[PDB]
Amino acid sequence: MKRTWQPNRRKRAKTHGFRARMRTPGGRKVLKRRRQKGRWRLTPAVRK
Amino acid sequence: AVKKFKPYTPSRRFMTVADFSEITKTEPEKSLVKPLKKTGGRNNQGRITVRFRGGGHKRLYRIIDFKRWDKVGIPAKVAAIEYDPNRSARIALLHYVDGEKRYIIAPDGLQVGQQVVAGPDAPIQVGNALPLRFIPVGTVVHAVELEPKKGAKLARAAGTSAQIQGREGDYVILRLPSGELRKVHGECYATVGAVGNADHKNIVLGKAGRSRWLGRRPHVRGAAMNPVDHPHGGGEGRAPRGRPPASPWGWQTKGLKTRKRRKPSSRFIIARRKK
RNA sequence: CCGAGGGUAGGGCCCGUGACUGGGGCGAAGUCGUAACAAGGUAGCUGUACCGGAAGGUGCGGCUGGAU
RNA sequence: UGGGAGAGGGUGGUGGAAUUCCCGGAGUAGCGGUGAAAUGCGCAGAUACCGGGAGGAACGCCGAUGGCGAAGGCAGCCACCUGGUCCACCCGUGACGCUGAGGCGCGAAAGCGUGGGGAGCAAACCGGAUUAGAUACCCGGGUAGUCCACGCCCUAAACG
RNA sequence: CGAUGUCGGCUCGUCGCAUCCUGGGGCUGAAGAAGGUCCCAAGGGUUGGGCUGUUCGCCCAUUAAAGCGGCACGCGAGCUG
RNA sequence: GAAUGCCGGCAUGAGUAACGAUAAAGAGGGUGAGAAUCCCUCUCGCCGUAAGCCCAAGGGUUCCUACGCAAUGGUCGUCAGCGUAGGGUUAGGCGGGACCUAAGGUGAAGCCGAAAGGCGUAGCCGAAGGGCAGCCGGUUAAUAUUCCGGCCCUUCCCGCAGGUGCGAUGGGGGGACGCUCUAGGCUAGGGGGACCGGAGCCAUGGACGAGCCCGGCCAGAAGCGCAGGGUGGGAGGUAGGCAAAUCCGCCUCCCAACAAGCUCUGCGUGGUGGGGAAGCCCGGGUGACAACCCCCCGAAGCCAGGGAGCCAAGAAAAGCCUCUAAGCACAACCUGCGGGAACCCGUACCGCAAACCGACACAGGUGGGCGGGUGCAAGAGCACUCAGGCGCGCGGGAGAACCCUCGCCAAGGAACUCUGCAAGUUGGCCCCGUAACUUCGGGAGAAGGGGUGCUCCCUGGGGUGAUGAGCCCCGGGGAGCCGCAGUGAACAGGCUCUGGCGACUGUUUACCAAAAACACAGCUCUCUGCGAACUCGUAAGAGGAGGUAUAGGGAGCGACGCUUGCCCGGUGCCGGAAGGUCAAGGGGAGGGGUGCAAGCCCCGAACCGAAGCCCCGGUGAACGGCGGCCGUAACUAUAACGGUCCUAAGGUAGCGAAAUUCCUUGUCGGGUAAGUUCCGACCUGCACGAAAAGCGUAACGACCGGAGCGCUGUCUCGGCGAGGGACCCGGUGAAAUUGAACUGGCCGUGAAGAUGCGGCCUACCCGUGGCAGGACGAAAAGACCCCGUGGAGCUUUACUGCAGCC
RNA sequence: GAGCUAGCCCUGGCCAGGGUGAAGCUGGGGUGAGACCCAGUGGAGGCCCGAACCGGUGGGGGAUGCAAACCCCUCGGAUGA
Numbered sequence A: 001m002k003r004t005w006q007p008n009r010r011k012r013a014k015t016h017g018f019r020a021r022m023r024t025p026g027g028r029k030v031l032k033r034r035r036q037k038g039r040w041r042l043t044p045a046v047r048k
Numbered sequence B: 001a002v003k004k005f006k007p008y009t010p011s012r013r014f015m016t017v018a019d020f021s022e023i024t025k026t027e028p029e030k031s032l033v034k035p036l037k038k039t040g041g042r043n044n045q046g047r048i049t050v051r052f053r054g055g056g057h058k059r060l061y062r063i064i065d066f067k068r069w070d071k072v073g074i075p076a077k078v079a080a081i082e083y084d085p086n087r088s089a090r091i092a093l094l095h096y097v098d099g100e101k102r103y104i105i106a107p108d109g110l111q112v113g114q115q116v117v118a119g120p121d122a123p124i125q126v127g128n129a130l131p132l133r134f135i136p137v138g139t140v141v142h143a144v145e146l147e148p149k150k151g152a153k154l155a156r157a158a159g160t161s162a163q164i165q166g167r168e169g170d171y172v173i174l175r176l177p178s179g180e181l182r183k184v185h186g187e188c189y190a191t192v193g194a195v196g197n198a199d200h201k202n203i204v205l206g207k208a209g210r211s212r213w214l215g216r217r218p219h220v221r222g223a224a225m226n227p228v229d230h231p232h233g234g235g236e237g238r239a240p241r242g243r244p245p246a247s248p249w250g251w252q253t254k255g256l257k258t259r260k261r262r263k264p265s266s267r268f269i270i271a272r273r274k275k
Numbered sequence C: 001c002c003g004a005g006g007g008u009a010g011g012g013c014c015c016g017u018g019a020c021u022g023g024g025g026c027g028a029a030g031u032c033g034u035a036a037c038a039a040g041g042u043a044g045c046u047g048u049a050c051c052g053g054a055a056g057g058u059g060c061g062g063c064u065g066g067a068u
Numbered sequence D: 001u002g003g004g005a006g007a008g009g010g011u012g013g014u015g016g017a018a019u020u021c022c023c024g025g026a027g028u029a030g031c032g033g034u035g036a037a038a039u040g041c042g043c044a045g046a047u048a049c050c051g052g053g054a055g056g057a058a059c060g061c062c063g064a065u066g067g068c069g070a071a072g073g074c075a076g077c078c079a080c081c082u083g084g085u086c087c088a089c090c091c092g093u094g095a096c097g098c099u100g101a102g103g104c105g106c107g108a109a110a111g112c113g114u115g116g117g118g119a120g121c122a123a124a125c126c127g128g129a130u131u132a133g134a135u136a137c138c139c140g141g142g143u144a145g146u147c148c149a150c151g152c153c154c155u156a157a158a159c160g
Numbered sequence E: 001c002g003a004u005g006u007c008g009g010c011u012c013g014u015c016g017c018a019u020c021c022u023g024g025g026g027c028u029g030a031a032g033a034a035g036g037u038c039c040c041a042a043g044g045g046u047u048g049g050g051c052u053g054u055u056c057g058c059c060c061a062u063u064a065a066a067g068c069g070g071c072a073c074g075c076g077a078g079c080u081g
Numbered sequence F: 001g002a003a004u005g006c007c008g009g010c011a012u013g014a015g016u017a018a019c020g021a022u023a024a025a026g027a028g029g030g031u032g033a034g035a036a037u038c039c040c041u042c043u044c045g046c047c048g049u050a051a052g053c054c055c056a057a058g059g060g061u062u063c064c065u066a067c068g069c070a071a072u073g074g075u076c077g078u079c080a081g082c083g084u085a086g087g088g089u090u091a092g093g094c095g096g097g098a099c100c101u102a103a104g105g106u107g108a109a110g111c112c113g114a115a116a117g118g119c120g121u122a123g124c125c126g127a128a129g130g131g132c133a134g135c136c137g138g139u140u141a142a143u144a145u146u147c148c149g150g151c152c153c154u155u156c157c158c159g160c161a162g163g164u165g166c167g168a169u170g171g172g173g174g175g176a177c178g179c180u181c182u183a184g185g186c187u188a189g190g191g192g193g194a195c196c197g198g199a200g201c202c203a204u205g206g207a208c209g210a211g212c213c214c215g216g217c218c219a220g221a222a223g224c225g226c227a228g229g230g231u232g233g234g235a236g237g238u239a240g241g242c243a244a245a246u247c248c249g250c251c252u253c254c255c256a257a258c259a260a261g262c263u264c265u266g267c268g269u270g271g272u273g274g275g276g277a278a279g280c281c282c283g284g285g286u287g288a289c290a291a292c293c294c295c296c297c298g299a300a301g302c303c304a305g306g307g308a309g310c311c312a313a314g315a316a317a318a319g320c321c322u323c324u325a326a327g328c329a330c331a332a333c334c335u336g337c338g339g340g341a342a343c344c345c346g347u348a349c350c351g352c353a354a355a356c357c358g359a360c361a362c363a364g365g366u367g368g369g370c371g372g373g374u375g376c377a378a379g380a381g382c383a384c385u386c387a388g389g390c391g392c393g394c395g396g397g398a399g400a401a402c403c404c405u406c407g408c409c410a411a412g413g414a415a416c417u418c419u420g421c422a423a424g425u426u427g428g429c430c431c432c433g434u435a436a437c438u439u440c441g442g443g444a445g446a447a448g449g450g451g452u453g454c455u456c457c458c459u460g461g462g463g464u465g466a467u468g469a470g471c472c473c474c475g476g477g478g479a480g481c482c483g484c485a486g487u488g489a490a491c492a493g494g495c496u497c498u499g500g501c502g503a504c505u506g507u508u509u510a511c512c513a514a515a516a517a518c519a520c521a522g523c524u525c526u527c528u529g530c531g532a533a534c535u536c537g538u539a540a541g542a543g544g545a546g547g548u549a550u551a552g553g554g555a556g557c558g559a560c561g562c563u564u565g566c567c568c569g570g571u572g573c574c575g576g577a578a579g580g581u582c583a584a585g586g587g588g589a590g591g592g593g594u595g596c597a598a599g600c601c602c603c604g605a606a607c608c609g610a611a612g613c614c615c616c617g618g619u620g621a622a623c624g625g626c627g628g629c630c631g632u633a634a635c636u637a638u639a640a641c642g643g644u645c646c647u648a649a650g651g652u653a654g655c656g657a658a659a660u661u662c663c664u665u666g667u668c669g670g671g672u673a674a675g676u677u678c679c680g681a682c683c684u685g686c687a688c689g690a691a692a693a694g695c696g697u698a699a700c701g702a703c704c705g706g707a708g709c710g711c712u713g714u715c716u717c718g719g720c721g722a723g724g725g726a727c728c729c730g731g732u733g734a735a736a737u738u739g740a741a742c743u744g745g746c747c748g749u750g751a752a753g754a755u756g757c758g759g760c761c762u763a764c765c766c767g768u769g770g771c772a773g774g775a776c777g778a779a780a781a782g783a784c785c786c787c788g789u790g791g792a793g794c795u796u797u798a799c800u801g802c803a804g805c806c
Numbered sequence G: 001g002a003g004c005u006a007g008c009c010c011u012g013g014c015c016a017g018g019g020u021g022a023a024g025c026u027g028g029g030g031u032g033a034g035a036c037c038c039a040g041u042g043g044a045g046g047c048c049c050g051a052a053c054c055g056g057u058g059g060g061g062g063a064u065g066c067a068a069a070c071c072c073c074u075c076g077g078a079u080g081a
């Protein structure tokens, strides 16, 4: 049947993207946290 | 005269529709329509604040002239009577000798080709607008301002009217469509006559689908719900109210008055509605 | 081919009969009240409507076939 | 052809008396009701009195043993639309008449449908009396209804 | 109670005997035929259906007879539900 | 050494289950160390409204080629979507951007919030909507509306010519719109041709034929033609379109009007440029100077912004045209022609799937377009087929039980069972014919029946064309032929009677409930006079509503019909300027501490003092509630009647052993041979009853009862047959479980149900196919039950707070 | 976190074929005029049959599955809430 992951590049960028994260105190702490941990990707990769 | 249907479906048996016999023009005036942003009952938070709204037919909003003292002395001709999906009354298209075109809500008995005018000097005729202080006591009136220059506020629904009861100082005394006796300032404008389309009240929607067309989503009884949802929720099997009948939010709903007590306009309500 | 009739299916009319139920007639001395006939003790009757163990009562309108 | 009388019918308007409720005044110890009472109402200011407002219904005197209509029935006043009818003249048509199974229409009250309206009155219903009882008569309340529009009902001591 | 699946049916049997039938008997208020009652006997047999989820029970039509009980009220790693 | 401990390794189950749709394979020839599995050929089967083709998303090199086979591939592998390497994606016109706006988002001004932040007009952003200029063919191993060829077109810059009051982010027009139905003319697409072009073919009894087989087009500028869409012209006044306006709007006058004209699309033709089959021969070449024509069918597509009707009344903004404003009129704009200029991103490949979402090369899920022919009434249904694509990545045998899916069955025909569950039966079209009841629509496909193929003969009407022929579409009558059978295959209702519940179509527990539950039109109560009530928010601000009592919120009831009784004492709600109580505050009789004293400081009675509560009324489609005992009639029995106690009042109409009745399978009647169910009655209703509505009700129902007909493998009662498994051989090879095991029966014993203890009995060692009685078999630290001063959801006249409101 | 699911908002798209035959309109009849009747035309509807599409009624299979909800047969809706 229809499953829960239905990929959509525009949805992915507008929801989890770098510019969505910077617009918000909570989103900015995510970027801060993921940098401190040393993540190679701060944000999901989307083709655009 | 509401129109009936032969019972050739279960729903056509009781469905009635307006006769639309007063209507003379069947597409609106392009310079006077703007899009009507449907809300679905949602506020600017996105939250539902009025339950059970949405999914009705698409509509354009017809700009209506609720001042009319905008154009004192300038007569106008009645060019058309049209359907308005945003109100129960019909609307009347006015061609001013100015060249300006405007909509008013159509009073009972108005005729295409007759002329209407507004001002202190206007003939006491159907369709004319005067300040309340110049209209003879006893005249049936509609589209009544509540405060001067603030816009017609009272008696706008199909078939309604207010009646001038008397004068006291700078104020006239009106019997509102509800039967309330109120003092309204004499400078307030009002239009001679009752609102038309008085057969509106006798339309039988006929089926559930017809409520969906009007943007009315199904209404769920409190007694059909669970206690998480409603004071009347729950119980094994059916259940009486078991408490004073209440709204979803806990307040009582069979008699509890809710007009704010210390309201400044109380000084101007003579007698509350009856019946 | 038609054809007595036999078969299948579905209708119409009549008769008999049926747990139970509805009122009706009748029946020497049952129980309750007293509606009508006297202004019958609230004049009567009336079509209708509502109510009441029961006769009845009451409303609306009509009639005199009502009295003084 | 010329005239007449009439609550004949339909539509719209509009006038005063009274009842009720509301507001203002003034005023105090009761009011109301009956055969007698009680219920009820009233010092939270009733009743009685004056001024003001709102609303509905019915039209006093004229009024009669009267008038009109086929009947049911029709009563303030005004305008408009409309029916029947009688008299005068003796002018026109030339028996064109009478009745009338069916049919069609009208048809008091009550009642029914959808709206409206609702002062007074009042089935049901409540209470107070009475009574052996009193699902009555009498008293205090009172909802349909009574009123308007449209549509049904089609009855009668619809009787001379 | 870190699970011994629970009513009834179906299927499949197997056992007990306090025996429903059939076999052998004594007594009879056993003329005969048919019964009653007790004793011996478990080899075999012990029907079809209407009603109800029913077990049970009642009823219809038969029968030599239409037995009662145990097996985790036998049997859900066999079925049903 | 134990923690259902943690991490890792390795066992057991086991050469076991399985190897992923039952669309299906066989052989020959290649290649190679090796071949059922790779390549080629022939034969066979499967899809064909797809299992073919083309877009979009998503994926991201998977594409093409060479070289490879460790691992990946459920087997094999020489093959591959795999490993290595090289190559491959070309645009002014296709899509997106340098254009426009939608919801929404953001947000100069402004508003609000302890901070973070929340709002917000314009503006901006935002598309699969609006706007905008490319069609056909060829070419590569792999791209192509992109390269090439042919014929076309757009914008920007500059210049030349001609014209004009030029000029805008401002005014106006336009853009610009629904649903159903639908005209005319066309195109796409299709069928036929005795015509035109073609390599050939004559078989096996016959045919050298008006034979068979194959094909018979595509694109195209101006012009022209056919069909449509859009659009009145002139003048005079003018105060409206937030400046102006010669534009638009409004008034008057003249002319035009199913027209015409002007304009804009579509289709046809059109210079020209392309394509072009079978068969044969090795993707190619030939065929070929290919032919390229007539007739019929015909769109849901096109003309289009077409027409009609209906009510629920159907985006915006830019491009565009017109008007003027500053400005400028040596400019600028319009028209024509010429030269020049024309950027960024995407483009490979998969795409109903082995490349996307499902951990898998997973019987699942995934939006748009094309989707041929014949026959069956039609159709996208069904069967067979074209183009094209596949045989589903383990096979070979055997022909047991048993399982699945399927076919048939003597006699009977529901006897099966909780239940006709399941499976039969019925089945399309045409014709005849069709009941109670009904809201007059329906019930209705009621029920029940007849017809159905093929041949010959005569004949009616329509479309096209020409009025005719031809082709095509609807029919009518007569005479015959064959079979068991003519919707001869495939797709395609079993029916009736009678109850309960719900009026109805709808909606629901994604994944055990589709229902009688929810909703529903409709009815009633209630709140709300507008800065409405109410809702969300600390607020600002929103929704309500750009609505205004014929409206909006809340509540119950639930089409419709006939109805909806009595009780206001308690609770709620509504009214009530009195009286009672009442907090802060006011008041200050009167005290007290301290000081030598002026003073400073403290306590403080009466009395004034809100809402609320008490109190007085009202109110039931507000919460709710609507009796007991005893007696009595000239047979008995039973009580219309009476007595008395209690209540705020004592259940009315209607219904009743019921979706409610305990005793109960009540009693009686009906149906049956037999009826705990069913239907109709009765009424001592344990414990119906009137909007948590009462009693009915045509129609409707994958709801739940009861009965009958039809027909059946449901059954008596089972039998045979088919295929997929099971079984055997070759290949690959799991799992939960597992203290160790050398693991028998009876009667006992034992923590009370023993392979393991006692006594006896029985038993050579090891497997394979089967069956499930035991191992208190497995699974899951019982969900029932209790316990824990464990948890959570929910209620309230439990306690205590808080929001909100007064 | 609403790329699942629930509701709403904006903008698009889809629903083979066949059946039934409302209003209205025209004509005829009728009448004082009417209502109304008949025929034809017409093409309404939470109308009917049935694909796509959307569902999930009954049964069977599946149950270390093809599948952490699937498969076969059957069944509901299919111009509308």
Ligand SMILES: CC(C)C[C@@H]1CCO[C@@H]2[C@H](CN[C@@H]2C(=O)N[C@H]2[C@H]3O[C@H](SCC/C=C\[C@H]2C)[C@H](O)[C@@H](O)[C@H]3O)C1
Residues within 6 Å of the ligand: E003, E005, E006
């Ligand atoms: C009167 C009655 C209440 C007595 C009661 C009967 C109920 O059960 C029995 C209790 C006694 N214990 C039994 C029980 O727990 N049984 C479990 C089963 O669960 C499934 S069987 C399907 C579920 C059924 C039963 C469960 C409760 C597993 O496979 C089985 O192994 C078994 O654990 C008694």
Ligand SMILES: [K+]
Residues within 6 Å of the ligand: F784
């Ligand atoms: K329990």
Ligand SMILES: [Mg+2]
Residues within 6 Å of the ligand: A001, A002
């Ligand atoms: Mg889903």
Ligand SMILES: [Mg+2]
Residues within 6 Å of the ligand: A006, G003
């Ligand atoms: Mg999605």
Ligand SMILES: [Mg+2]
Residues within 6 Å of the ligand: A008, A009, A010, A011
């Ligand atoms: Mg995207």
Ligand SMILES: [Mg+2]
Residues within 6 Å of the ligand: A010
């Ligand atoms: Mg996207």
Ligand SMILES: [Mg+2]
Residues within 6 Å of the ligand: A008, A010, A011
């Ligand atoms: Mg998105």
Ligand SMILES: [Mg+2]
Residues within 6 Å of the ligand: A011
């Ligand atoms: Mg989305």
Ligand SMILES: [Mg+2]
Residues within 6 Å of the ligand: A014, A015, A020
């Ligand atoms: Mg976001």
Ligand SMILES: [Mg+2]
Residues within 6 Å of the ligand: A013, A014, A015, A016, A017, A018, A019, A020, A021
């Ligand atoms: Mg972002």
Ligand SMILES: [Mg+2]
Residues within 6 Å of the ligand: A025, F116
């Ligand atoms: Mg911050």
Ligand SMILES: [Mg+2]
Residues within 6 Å of the ligand: A025, A028
């Ligand atoms: Mg920060």
Ligand SMILES: [Mg+2]
Residues within 6 Å of the ligand: A040
């Ligand atoms: Mg790095």
Ligand SMILES: [Mg+2]
Residues within 6 Å of the ligand: A016, A021, A030, A042, A043, A044
């Ligand atoms: Mg992140």
Ligand SMILES: [Mg+2]
Residues within 6 Å of the ligand: B003, B004, B005, B006, B012, B013, B014, B015, B016
């Ligand atoms: Mg109707």
Ligand SMILES: [Mg+2]
Residues within 6 Å of the ligand: B018, B019, B020, B021, B022, B023, B090, B197
């Ligand atoms: Mg109208």
